[PDB]
Amino acid sequence: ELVNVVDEKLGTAYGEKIDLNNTNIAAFIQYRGLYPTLAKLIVKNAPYESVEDVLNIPGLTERQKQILRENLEHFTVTEVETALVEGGDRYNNGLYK
Amino acid sequence: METLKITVYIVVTFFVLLFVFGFLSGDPARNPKRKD
Amino acid sequence: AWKGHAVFRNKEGEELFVRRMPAFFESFPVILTDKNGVVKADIPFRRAESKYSFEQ
Amino acid sequence: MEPNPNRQPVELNRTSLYLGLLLILVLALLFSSYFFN
Amino acid sequence: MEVNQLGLIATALFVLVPSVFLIILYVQTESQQK
Amino acid sequence: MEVNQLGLIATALFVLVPSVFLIILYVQTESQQK
Amino acid sequence: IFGIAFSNKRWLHFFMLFVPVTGLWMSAIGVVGLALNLRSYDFISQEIRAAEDPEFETFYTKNLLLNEGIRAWMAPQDQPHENFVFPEEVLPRGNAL
Amino acid sequence: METITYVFIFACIIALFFFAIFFREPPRIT
Amino acid sequence: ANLWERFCNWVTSTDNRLYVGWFGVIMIPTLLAATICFVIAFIAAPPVDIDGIREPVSGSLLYGNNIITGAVVPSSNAIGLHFYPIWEAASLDEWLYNGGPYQLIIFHFLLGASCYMGRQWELSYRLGMRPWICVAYSAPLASAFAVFLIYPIGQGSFSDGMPLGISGTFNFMIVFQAEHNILMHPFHQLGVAGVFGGALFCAMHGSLVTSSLIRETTETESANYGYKFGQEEETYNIVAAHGYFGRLIFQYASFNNSRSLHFFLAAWPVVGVWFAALGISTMAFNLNGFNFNHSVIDAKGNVINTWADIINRANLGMEVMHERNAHNFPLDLA
Amino acid sequence: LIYPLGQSSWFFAPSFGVAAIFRFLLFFQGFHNWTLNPFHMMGVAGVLG
Amino acid sequence: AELTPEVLTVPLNSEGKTITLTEKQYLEGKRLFQYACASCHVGGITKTNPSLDLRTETLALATPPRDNIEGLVDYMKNPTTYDGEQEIAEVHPSLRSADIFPKMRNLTEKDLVAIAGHILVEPKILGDKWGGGKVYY
Amino acid sequence: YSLGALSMMGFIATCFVWFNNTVYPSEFYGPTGPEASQAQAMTFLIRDQKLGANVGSAQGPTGLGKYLMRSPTGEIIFGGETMRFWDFRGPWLEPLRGPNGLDLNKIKNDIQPWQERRAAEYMTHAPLGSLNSVGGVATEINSVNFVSPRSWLATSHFVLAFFFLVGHLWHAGRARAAAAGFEKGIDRESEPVLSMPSLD
Amino acid sequence: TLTYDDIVGTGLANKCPTLDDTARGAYPIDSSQTYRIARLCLQPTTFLVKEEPKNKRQEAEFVPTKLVTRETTSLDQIQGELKVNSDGSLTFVEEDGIDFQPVTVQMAGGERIPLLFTVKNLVASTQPNVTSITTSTDFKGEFNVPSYRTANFLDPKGRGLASGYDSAIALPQAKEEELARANVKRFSLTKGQISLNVAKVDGRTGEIAGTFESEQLSDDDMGAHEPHEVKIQGVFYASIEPA
Ligand code: CLA
Ligand code: CLA
Ligand code: CLA
Ligand SMILES: CC(C)=CCC/C(C)=C/CC/C(C)=C/CC/C(C)=C/CC/C(C)=C/CC/C(C)=C/CC/C(C)=C/CC/C(C)=C/CC/C(C)=C/CC1=CC(=O)C(C)=C(C)C1=O
Ligand SMILES: CC(C)=CCC/C(C)=C/CC/C(C)=C/CC/C(C)=C/CC/C(C)=C/CC/C(C)=C/CC/C(C)=C/CC/C(C)=C/CC/C(C)=C/CC1=CC(=O)C(C)=C(C)C1=O
Ligand SMILES: CCCCCCCCCCCCCCCC(=O)OC[C@H](CO[C@@H]1O[C@H](CS(=O)(=O)O)[C@@H](O)[C@H](O)[C@H]1O)OC(=O)CCCCCCCCCCCCCCC
Ligand SMILES: CCCCCCCCCCCCCCCC(=O)OC[C@H](COP(=O)(O)OC[C@@H](O)CO)OC(=O)CCCCCCCCCCCCCCC
Ligand SMILES: CCCCCCCCCCCCO[C@@H]1O[C@H](CO)[C@@H](O[C@H]2O[C@H](CO)[C@@H](O)[C@H](O)[C@H]2O)[C@H](O)[C@H]1O
Ligand SMILES: CCCCCCCCCCCCO[C@@H]1O[C@H](CO)[C@@H](O[C@H]2O[C@H](CO)[C@@H](O)[C@H](O)[C@H]2O)[C@H](O)[C@H]1O
Ligand SMILES: CCCCCCCS[C@@H]1O[C@H](CO)[C@@H](O)[C@H](O)[C@H]1O
Ligand SMILES: [Cl-]
Ligand SMILES: [Cl-]
Numbered sequence A: 001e002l003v004n005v006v007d008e009k010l011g012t013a014y015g016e017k018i019d020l021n022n023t024n025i026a027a028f029i030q031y032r033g034l035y036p037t038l039a040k041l042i043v044k045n046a047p048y049e050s051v052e053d054v055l056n057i058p059g060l061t062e063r064q065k066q067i068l069r070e071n072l073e074h075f076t077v078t079e080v081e082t083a084l085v086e087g088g089d090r091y092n093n094g095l096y097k
Numbered sequence B: 001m002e003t004l005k006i007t008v009y010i011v012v013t014f015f016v017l018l019f020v021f022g023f024l025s026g027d028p029a030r031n032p033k034r035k036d
Numbered sequence C: 001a002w003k004g005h006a007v008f009r010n011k012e013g014e015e016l017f018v019r020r021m022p023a024f025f026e027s028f029p030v031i032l033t034d035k036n037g038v039v040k041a042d043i044p045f046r047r048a049e050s051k052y053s054f055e056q
Numbered sequence D: 001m002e003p004n005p006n007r008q009p010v011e012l013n014r015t016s017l018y019l020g021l022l023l024i025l026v027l028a029l030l031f032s033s034y035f036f037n
Numbered sequence E, F: 001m002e003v004n005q006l007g008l009i010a011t012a013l014f015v016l017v018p019s020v021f022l023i024i025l026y027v028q029t030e031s032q033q034k
Numbered sequence G: 001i002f003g004i005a006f007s008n009k010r011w012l013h014f015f016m017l018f019v020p021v022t023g024l025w026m027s028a029i030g031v032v033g034l035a036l037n038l039r040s041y042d043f044i045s046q047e048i049r050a051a052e053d054p055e056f057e058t059f060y061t062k063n064l065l066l067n068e069g070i071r072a073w074m075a076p077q078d079q080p081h082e083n084f085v086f087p088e089e090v091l092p093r094g095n096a097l
Numbered sequence H: 001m002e003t004i005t006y007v008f009i010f011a012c013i014i015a016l017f018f019f020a021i022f023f024r025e026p027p028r029i030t
Numbered sequence I: 001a002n003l004w005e006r007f008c009n010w011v012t013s014t015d016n017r018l019y020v021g022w023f024g025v026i027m028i029p030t031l032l033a034a035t036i037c038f039v040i041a042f043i044a045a046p047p048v049d050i051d052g053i054r055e056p057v058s059g060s061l062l063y064g065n066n067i068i069t070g071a072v073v074p075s076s077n078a079i080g081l082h083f084y085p086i087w088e089a090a091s092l093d094e095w096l097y098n099g100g101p102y103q104l105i106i107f108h109f110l111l112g113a114s115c116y117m118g119r120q121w122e123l124s125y126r127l128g129m130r131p132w133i134c135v136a137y138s139a140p141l142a143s144a145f146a147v148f149l150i151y152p153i154g155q156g157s158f159s160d161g162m163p164l165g166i167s168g169t170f171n172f173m174i175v176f177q178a179e180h181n182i183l184m185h186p187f188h189q190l191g192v193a194g195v196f197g198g199a200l201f202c203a204m205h206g207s208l209v210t211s212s213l214i215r216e217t218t219e220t221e222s223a224n225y226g227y228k229f230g231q232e233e234e235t236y237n238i239v240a241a242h243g244y245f246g247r248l249i250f251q252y253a254s255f256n257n258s259r260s261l262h263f264f265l266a267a268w269p270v271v272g273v274w275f276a277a278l279g280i281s282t283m284a285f286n287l288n289g290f291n292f293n294h295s296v297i298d299a300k301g302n303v304i305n306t307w308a309d310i311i312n313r314a315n316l317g318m319e320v321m322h323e324r325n326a327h328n329f330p331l332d333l334a
Numbered sequence J: 001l002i003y004p005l006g007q008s009s010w011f012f013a014p015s016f017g018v019a020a021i022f023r024f025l026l027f028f029q030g031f032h033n034w035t036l037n038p039f040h041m042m043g044v045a046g047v048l049g
Numbered sequence K: 001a002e003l004t005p006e007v008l009t010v011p012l013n014s015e016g017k018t019i020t021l022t023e024k025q026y027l028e029g030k031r032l033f034q035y036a037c038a039s040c041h042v043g044g045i046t047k048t049n050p051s052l053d054l055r056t057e058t059l060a061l062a063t064p065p066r067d068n069i070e071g072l073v074d075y076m077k078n079p080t081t082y083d084g085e086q087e088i089a090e091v092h093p094s095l096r097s098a099d100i101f102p103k104m105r106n107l108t109e110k111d112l113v114a115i116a117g118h119i120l121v122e123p124k125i126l127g128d129k130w131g132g133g134k135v136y137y
Numbered sequence L: 001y002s003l004g005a006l007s008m009m010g011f012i013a014t015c016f017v018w019f020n021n022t023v024y025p026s027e028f029y030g031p032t033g034p035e036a037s038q039a040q041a042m043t044f045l046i047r048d049q050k051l052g053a054n055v056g057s058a059q060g061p062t063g064l065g066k067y068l069m070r071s072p073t074g075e076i077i078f079g080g081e082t083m084r085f086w087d088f089r090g091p092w093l094e095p096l097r098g099p100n101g102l103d104l105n106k107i108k109n110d111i112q113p114w115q116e117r118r119a120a121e122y123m124t125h126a127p128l129g130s131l132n133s134v135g136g137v138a139t140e141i142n143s144v145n146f147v148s149p150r151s152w153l154a155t156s157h158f159v160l161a162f163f164f165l166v167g168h169l170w171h172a173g174r175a176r177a178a179a180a181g182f183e184k185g186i187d188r189e190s191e192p193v194l195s196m197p198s199l200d
Numbered sequence M: 001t002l003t004y005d006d007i008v009g010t011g012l013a014n015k016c017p018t019l020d021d022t023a024r025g026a027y028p029i030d031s032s033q034t035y036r037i038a039r040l041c042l043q044p045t046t047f048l049v050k051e052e053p054k055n056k057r058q059e060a061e062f063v064p065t066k067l068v069t070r071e072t073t074s075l076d077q078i079q080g081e082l083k084v085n086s087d088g089s090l091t092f093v094e095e096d097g098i099d100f101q102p103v104t105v106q107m108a109g110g111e112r113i114p115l116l117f118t119v120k121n122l123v124a125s126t127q128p129n130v131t132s133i134t135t136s137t138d139f140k141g142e143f144n145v146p147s148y149r150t151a152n153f154l155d156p157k158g159r160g161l162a163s164g165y166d167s168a169i170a171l172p173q174a175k176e177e178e179l180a181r182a183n184v185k186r187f188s189l190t191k192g193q194i195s196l197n198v199a200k201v202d203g204r205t206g207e208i209a210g211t212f213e214s215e216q217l218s219d220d221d222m223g224a225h226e227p228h229e230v231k232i233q234g235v236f237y238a239s240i241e242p243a
Helices: A005-009 A026-031 A038-043 A051-056 A062-074 A081-086 B001-023 D014-037 E007-030 F007-031 G009-034 G044-052 G059-078 H002-022 I003-011 I023-043 I092-097 I100-126 I131-154 I166-180 I188-212 I238-248 I258-282 I306-319 J003-006 J018-032 J038-048 K023-036 K038-044 K057-061 K069-077 K109-129 L004-017 L034-051 L082-083 L104-109 L113-123 L149-180 M177-185
Strands: C013-016 C031-033 C039-042 K009-010 K018-020 L068-070 L076-078 M035-049 M062-064 M075-084 M089-097 M098-105 M113-116 M124-127 M140-145 M191-203 M208-217 M229-243
Touching: A026 A038, A026 G059, A026 K023, A038 L034, A051 A062, A051 F007, A081 K018, A081 M140, B001 G059, C013 L076, G009 I023, G009 I188, G009 J038, G059 I166, G059 I306, G059 J018, G059 M098, I023 I100, I023 J018, I023 M124, I092 I100, I100 I131, I100 L104, I100 L149, I131 I258, I131 L004, I131 L149, I131 M062, I166 I258, I166 I306, I166 L113, I188 I238, I188 I258, I188 J038, I258 L149, I306 J018, I306 L149, J018 M062, K009 K109, K023 K038, K023 K109, K038 M140, K057 M035, K069 K109, L034 L082, L034 L104, L034 L113, L076 L082, M035 M089, M035 M098, M035 M113, M089 M140, M113 M140, M140 M208
Parallel strands: none
Antiparallel strands: C013 C031, C031 C039, K009 K018, L068 L076, M035 M062, M035 M075, M035 M229, M075 M089, M089 M124, M098 M113, M124 M140, M140 M191, M191 M208, M208 M229
C-alpha cells in the first residue's frame, strides 16, 4: 500500500530522460543550449501535456524553438509529483557537488 | 516575567554590592601576619 | 528454513551480485555488480541524481 | 563535642542471626509465589 | 509462565535487605571484646 | 522505553552486594575495642 | 575549599599510582572486546523507539549518523583490499553538504 | 523504572558527598 | 561590634568548615542555581530545538534518555548569541522549547567557577599560604570557558556550545574534528602531551614515593598507618627513590630536589591544558589544524595519498552527515 | 597485538605514525562507537583524573 | 608516470588543431589559476555555482565550445552564460571587467593561454577528480 | 593591575576584529564570519532567483524558508544556518533592508551587479583556514593560500589576552603574599593554621 | 516613517500594519480597470486545535494552545491579481510572497503541534456586486497545505523521501511490516479554507484591514501519524492598487 513516490517515479520515463514537469533545473546542463535561458522558461511554464508542448511557450525565439526540437528526444513528461515540485525544489533541490 | 526580572535584578545587585563593599572593607589586612 | 538462493538480474537478463557486508560494518549499502565487478545497480540515498536504482 | 552518654552497644548473637535468617528466608519462600503471581 | 516482572526484584530485596541488616548486627557483635 | 527486564535487578544487586560488604566491614571495625 | 582533603601522605601517593594505572587497564579491557567487534555500539531501547517514532532524537542517534558518514566516506580508501566502489548516489549525506 | 534507578543512584551519591564532608573522620595531629 | 564588621568577619573567617569569602558570596548562589537547574533539566526537560530548524532533540531522562545519552541541550540556533533569560520568553513552555535552561546553567556555572578560582586565592591569603593553586585551576577553568563561551562566540551561536551531557560531548568532539581537524592542531597535540604526560607523571610520582616508604608497620597492617597526620619527619626516603630512578634512566634525568619535582608535576599538565584550552579558543575563530590534503604529488601530478588524506575522508563523512537538515547552501561557513 | 589478532589482519592494527594514530582514533569512532564504551570512559577518567 | 608532451598536448580550437604546452607553461597556468581563479574553481568545481564545473566534457557542451585554448581565452575576455545567451563580465572576472576585477588587470595573452592550458590539462591528470568535488577528495 | 587591564583589552580587541566592520573595514581585513555566511545566502538567493525561483515562498526541507525566514522578533532574515547571523549589517546588504527586515520587492528588483560581486567575494573569502594557510573548511584540498587577517588577529589576541590574565593572577597573588610577608613560604616557628581551631 | 533600527528586536516586525478607527470608508472598483493586491499581511493572534476524544460521539472542541516558536508566525509581502468578475465579485489570486510559516504550539499537558501556517496558492472571492469595497465586504477561499517538511527532510535515523535510508538500519534483521509507516515517507497535500472580514477601509489609499479565520491540517511528520485540525484567527492588512 504505502509507496515511496520518488522511487516509483524512477521507474517511469522520469528515470530515463529530463521530465519537463518534475526534473530539477540543473539537469538541463546535460545538453548544449538549454541552460539557463530555456531551462528557466521550461520550468516556469510547466506542466506540459506532451513533450512537444514545450515549443509553445510564449515569447520563444525561432532559434530557441530550433534548439528545443533538437532536444525533444532527451525530454519526457509524466504527471506532476508534489514531492518533487514543492519547496522550490525544481530550482534548488539541495544537491550541489 | 516582569516580576521575575525585577526580582533577579534585585537579588544580583544585592550580592554584587556585598562582593564590592566586602573587598573594600580593609581586605589586605585580613591575613594572618601583617594586619596593618 | 532456507528461502533459497537469490539470483538477481537486470532488464537485460545479466546476472547481478549483491556486495556482501564485511564484519566491520554495523550497516552497509546495497550495491550490485556484474561478474566482473562493474556496478550495475544499487539502492540510492539521494534520489535526484540516481542512475543505478532498481527501478531504472 | 563531649560524648553522648546515652550511647549503647548493640548485639545480635549467633542463634538470633540463625533465627532471623530462617524467618526471612521462610517468609520469602512463602510470599514469593504471590509476588510473581 | 507470564509472571509479574517485578516479582524477581521484590523477592530479592525482601530477602537481601533484612538478611543483610542481621549480618551487619551479628558481625559487629562478634568483633566486640570480652 | 523497551529496556532489558533484568536491568533493574542487575543494577540493584550491583549496588547492594558490594556496598553491604563494605558496610559490614566498617561497622565491625567501629565496634572493636579502642 | 573542596570539602575533603588528604590527611595521609602515603595514601595520597598510592592513590596517584592507583588512578591512571587502573584507568589504562580498564581501556585495555574494552579494546580486547573490540578485537572481536564486541562493541558498546548501540542502546537497543533507543533503536526500537527511534525506528517506530520518527520524531524521537537524542545525541546518541545523532552520533550514529556521524559514524555512518565516517564508514561510507573513509572505507574505500582506508580499506583498499576491499575494492569498494560506492557510486555517489549511495553515499549518506545531509542536505546541501 | 530506569529513570527512578538513575535518579536513585545519583541521590545516594549526593548523600554520600554530605556524609563524607560533614561526618568525615576528623584529621588529628597526634 | 558593628553589624557590617561582624558580617565581614564571618564571611572571611578562617574557621568556617567551608570557607565563604567574598568570591564565595557570588560563587554560592550561582553554583546552586546552575546545579538545581541542571538536575531538574537533566531529569525532566522536554526536547530542545538546538539547531533552530524545529527539530527538537530530547535530552532528559523522562523523555527517553539514559545516563549516557542524556544532556541539557544547547539553546536554539535561532537565538544565536542573543541573551535568552526566562523573562525574555512568553512562557516557560517557549523557554524550554528554545533551550533556555542551557544558557541559565552555563552562565551561572562559568561565573561560579571563576569565583571558585578567586576563592582559592582568597583562602590561601587568609591561611598565609603561597597564592598560585588558583593558577593551576585556571587550566581546567579556561577549558570550560573555551567550550561553553569562546567557541559559541566565534561561531556566532550558543547552539554550538558543548552540550551538558555525555553523548552530547562526543557529538561536539566529532563535529569539531570535521570542521577544524583539531587532531592535526599542535595546541590539541600539546594538550594530549599534557594529559598523557600528567597521568604518566602521576603514576610515576605515586609509584616512586610509595616504593621508598620507611618501614613503620607490620605485615598484618596497612603501610598507610606508618604515617601520622602532621608529623614533622618525611615518611619516605627521597635519596632511595632518586637512587632508583637515576639508575632507571640516568642520574641526571632524576629529580633530587622535591620542590623542583613538585613544580614540574604542577607545570607540565597545567601548561599542556592551557594550550588545549587555547586550541579550542583559537579554532573558535577558525584557525584550524594543519591541512595536508593532496600535499604529496607524483611526477605526472597524481595525488599520492598520505594518512592525512585518510583522516580527511573520515572528516568528510562527519561533515556531510552532521545536522543533516540544517544546511541549504554548499559551504558550512559557521 | 590483541586487537589486530581478533580482526582480519595486522592491517587494522595502529600504524606507527602521528596522523596514522589519528586515523586509528577516527576509525574506532565510526566503526566501533568507541566513545560509547564504558571501559574507554573509565580510561578517560583515569587519564584526566 | 610523467607530465609528458602528450599530456601537455591540448586542443587549440574546435577544428582539431592542437598546441603542445611546455612544462613552464603548465606551472605558469597552475600559478595564475591559483592567483585569479581557485578562490571559486578549486579542483575544477564552482563554489558560487556548483551546477557548472570545468570538466572538459562540460566545456565541450558550452556555447560557444570552451573545450579548447581559444574558447577558454575568449571566455576570460568575454564570459557568457552556459548557452552563450548572456554576457556576464559584470559578475565574472574578465579582461573586459578588469576594472572591477583588478586581478585580471595585468594578464597578457600568454597568461590566459597558460590558464586555459591548466584547465584542459588537469582533468587529463586527475580524471573524474577534476570537477568532481568533495566526493573525490 | 595593568596585566588585568591589558587582558581585558585583549579580549575586547579579539571581539572587535571578529565582529566589527566599521573600524575594521572588510575591504581591508576581509569579511567577518557573520558577513561571509550572510554573503553565501545572498549569493544563492541571487542565483536561484535568476533561474526563476520565488525566493520568498520557497519552503526549505525543515519547513522554514530556504532563502528567507523570520528572526525570533519577526524581522525578515536569510534562511539556513545563517539564521544565527541576522544581526549582521554591511554596506553591500543594507540597500535591501527595510523597516521589516529584508525587503522582497528590493530583493526581486534592485540587487545590483556590485552586490552580487561583493557577496561572491565575501562568501569565498570567509575567515576559515588551516594553520599552514590552506583556505576554507578543514576538508578542503590544497590550492588556495588564505587565512583571514581577522582570524590571525582574533586568535593571536585571545592567546595574549589569556596569558595576560594568568599573569594578572600570578602577580596579584604574589603581590598580596609579598606585602603580607609570606611569599617565600610559611614560617615554621609561627604556622598560622597551627594557631587556628580545628574545623571538626 | 519608522526605520529598521526603530523596529529591530521589538516584535513589531511580526505585526501587520493597522488602520485608524476613522477608516470606515469605501474603495471604488472600476470594472474597466485591472487591479492587484500589492501587499497582503496575516498576523495570527490565536491558534486553536481540535480535540480528538476517544468518545467519537461527543462534539469535539477547538481548544487554546501555547505558542513556543516566538514571533515568527506572520504571513507578509504577499501579492497577486485582484480580478473583477462578471457578477461584480472580486477574486484574489495569490501569486507570491512570504506565504507560509512553520509554527509549533503546545496543548495543555505538553503535546506539541507543529503546522505549516499558510495561504499558498490562495484563491479567495467576495460576494457578487462589489462596486466599492466596504466594511461589509469579505473574501472566502481555499489554499494548498503542502507537507510541513519537504522531500529532502531526514528523520533522526536518516530515513527520508527524496533522500535517506529506506529502512531501519539499526535493526538489520527486524521484520519490516510493522515499521512500514515510519520507513516509507509520504508527502502530504491537503486543502485549507479561509475567511477574511474587512473591518476597516481607507478609500483614499486603497488599504483594507480586518480579521481572518483559517482552517487547515497540522504536520503529519511525512505520513508517520495522523494530522490535527487547526483553526487560526488573527488580523490582516491589504493594499490594493490599480494595475
Ligand atoms: C578526553 C579525551 C580522551 C582521553 C583523555 C582519552 C584517553 C585514552 N584513550 Mg581515547 N579517544 C578519544 C578521547 C580520549 N581518549 C576519542 C574522542 C576517540 C574516538 C573514538 C578516542 C579513540 C581511542 C582509541 C582507538 C584508543 C584510545 C585509547 C586511550 C587510552 C590511551 C592510554 C595511553 O597512554 O596509550 C599510549 C600507549 C601506551 C601507554 C603503550 C606503551 C607506550 C610506550 C611506553 C612508549 C615507549 C616510548 C619510547 C621511549 C619511544 C619514543 C620514541 C619517540 C621518538 C616517539 C587512554 C585511556 C587507547 C586505548 O584504549 O588503549 C587500551 C586506544 O587504542 N582512544
Ligand atoms: C599580533 C601578532 C601577530 C599576528 C596576528 C601576525 C599575523 C600574520 N603574520 Mg606576522 N609577525 C609577528 C606577529 C604577528 N603576525 C611577530 C612577533 C614577528 C616577528 C617574528 C612577525 C613576522 C612575520 C613575517 C616574516 C611574516 C608574518 C606573516 C603573518 C601572516 C601569516 C602568519 C603565519 O603563517 O603564522 C604561522 C604560525 C606560527 C609561526 C605559530 C605561532 C605559534 C606561537 C609560537 C605560539 C604563541 C603562544 C604564546 C605566545 C606562547 C606562550 C608560552 C606560555 C607557556 C607562557 C599573518 C597575517 C607572513 C605574511 O604573510 O606577511 C605578509 C610572513 O611572511 N609575520
Ligand atoms: C607580539 C606582540 C604583539 C604584536 C606584534 C601586536 C600587534 C598588533 N596589535 Mg596587539 N597586544 C599585545 C601584543 C602584540 N600586539 C598584548 C600582549 C596585548 C595585551 C593582551 C595586546 C593588546 C592589543 C589591543 C587591545 C589591540 C591590539 C592591536 C594590534 C594591532 C595594532 C596595534 C596598534 O595600532 O596599537 C596602537 C598604537 C599605539 C597605542 C601607539 C601610539 C599610536 C598613536 C596614538 C597613533 C596616532 C596616529 C594618528 C592617526 C596620526 C595623526 C597625525 C595627524 C596629526 C596628521 C597590531 C597588529 C589592535 C588590533 O588590531 O586588534 C585586533 C588592538 O585594538 N593589541
Ligand atoms: C540528575 C542526574 C542523574 C544527574 C547526573 C548526570 C550525569 C551526566 C552524571 C555524570 C555521571 C558520571 C560521574 C560518569 C563518570 C563515570 C566514570 C567514567 C567513572 C570512572 C570509574 C573508574 C573506576 C575509573 C577508573 C580510573 C579511576 C580510579 C579514576 C578515579 C578518578 C578520581 C576520583 C580522581 C581524583 C579526583 C579528585 C577531584 C581528587 C581530589 C583529591 C584532593 C582532595 C586533592 C587535594 C590535595 C592535594 C595535595 O597535594 C595535598 C598535600 C592535600 C593535603 C590535598 O588535600
Ligand atoms: C643482543 C645484544 C647486542 C645485547 C647487548 C645489550 C647490552 C649489554 C648493551 C650494552 C651497551 C648499551 C647500553 C647499548 C644501548 C643502546 C641504546 C642507546 C639503546 C637505546 C634504547 C632506547 C630506545 C632508549 C629510550 C630512551 C629513553 C628511556 C627515553 C625516555 C627518557 C625520558 C624523556 C624520560 C622522562 C624524563 C622525566 C621528565 C622524568 C621525570 C618523571 C617524574 C615526574 C618522576 C617523579 C619523581 C622523580 C624523582 O626523581 C623522584 C626522586 C621522585 C620521588 C618522583 O616522584
Ligand atoms: C529550590 C530551592 C532550594 C532552597 C535551598 C535552601 C537553602 C539552604 C538554607 C539552609 C542553610 C542550612 C545549611 C547549612 C549546611 C552547612 O554547610 O553548615 C556547615 C557549616 C556550619 O555553619 C556554622 O554554623 C554555626 C552555628 S551552628 O553550628 O549551626 O549552631 C556558626 O557558629 C558558624 O559560624 C557557621 O559557619 O557551615 C559553614 O561551614 C559555613 C557556610 C558554608 C556554606 C556552604 C557552601 C555551599 C556551597 C554549595 C555550592 C555547590 C553546589 C552544590 C553541589 C552539590
Ligand atoms: C563549595 C564546596 C564545593 C564542594 C562540593 C562537594 C564535592 C564532593 C567531594 C567528594 C566527596 C566524596 C568523597 C568520598 C571519599 C572520601 O571521603 O575521601 C576522603 C579521603 C581522605 O583521605 P585521607 O588521606 O584522610 O585518608 C586516606 C587513608 O588514610 C584511608 O585508608 O580523600 C581522598 O582520598 C582524596 C581522593 C578521593 C577524591 C575523590 C573525589 C570525588 C570526586 C567526585 C566524583 C563523583 C562525581 C559523581 C557525580 C554524579
Ligand atoms: C541495605 C540494608 C542495610 C541495613 C543497614 C543497617 C545499619 C545498621 C548499623 C548498625 C550500627 C552499629 O553501630 C555501632 O555500634 C557499636 C556497638 O554495637 C559501636 O561500638 C562501640 O561499642 C563497642 C562495645 O562496647 C566498643 O567496643 C566500641 O569501641 C565502641 O565504639 C560502634 O561505634 C557503632 O558504629
Ligand atoms: C557611584 C559611582 C561613583 C564612584 C564611587 C567612588 C566612591 C568610592 C567610595 C568607597 C567607600 C568605601 O568605604 C569603605 O567602607 C568600608 C566598610 O564601611 C570600610 O571598612 C572599615 O569598616 C568596617 C566596619 O564597618 C570594617 O569591617 C573594616 O575592617 C574597616 O576597614 C573602609 O575602611 C572604607 O574605606
Ligand atoms: C520538582 C517539580 C518539577 C517538575 C515539573 C515538571 C513540569 S510539569 C509536567 O509537564 C508535562 C509536559 O508538559 C506534563 O505531561 C505533566 O503532566 C506535568 O506534570
Ligand atoms: Cl550532528
Ligand atoms: Cl545553510
